[PDB]
Design a binder for this molecule. Structure first.
Ligand SMILES: C=CCn1c(S)nnc1OCc1ccccc1
Length: 133
């Protein structure tokens, strides 16, 4: 019953500062432009201890499945090959991605009827808000 409030199908409704976040990550011009247009649907489900987060968009489709606290390999939408670990901290899903001596953290939380995603790379934050589809 851990992540019950996250489960469902969600659609992106707003984004702030995502271009600056992508720049800080190292994403190149053309990928930033295309990725920045996309309005992904995020599909979250749970089966036993395994959480699956799918992103379906016009830019890229991705899917990760994981157990909390247990590191996994992830290929991101912008084609980084990262090592990821996702934990639950006070009701917030905290997703750390490590690659090439770099790190970024993506936090997902329920706020009212929204699912709010905060993406941080060094001093740069982007906030992405999803609503139920
Ligand atoms: C980090 C946020 C996770 N997310 C959301 S929210 N929409 N798309 C996402 O994929 C990650 C990404 C896309 C493009 C460039 C770098 C990273």
């Amino acid at each position: 019953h851990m992540c019950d409030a996250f489960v469902g199908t969600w659609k992106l409704v707003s984004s702030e500062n995502f271009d600056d976040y992508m720049k800080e990550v190292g994403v190149g011009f053309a990928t930033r432009k295309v990725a920045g247009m996309a309005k992904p649907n995020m599909i979250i489900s749970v089966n036993g201890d395994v959480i699956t987060i799918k992103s379906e968009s016009t830019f890229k489709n991705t899917e990760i499945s994981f157990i909390l606290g247990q590191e996994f390999d992830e290929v991101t939408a912008d084609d980084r090959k990262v090592k990821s670990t996702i934990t639950l901290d006070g009701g917030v899903l905290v997703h750390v991605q490590k690659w090439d001596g770099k790190s970024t953290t993506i936090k997902r939380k329920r706020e009212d009827d929204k699912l709010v995603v905060e993406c941080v790379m060094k001093g740069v934050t982007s906030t992405r808000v999803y609503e139920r589809a």
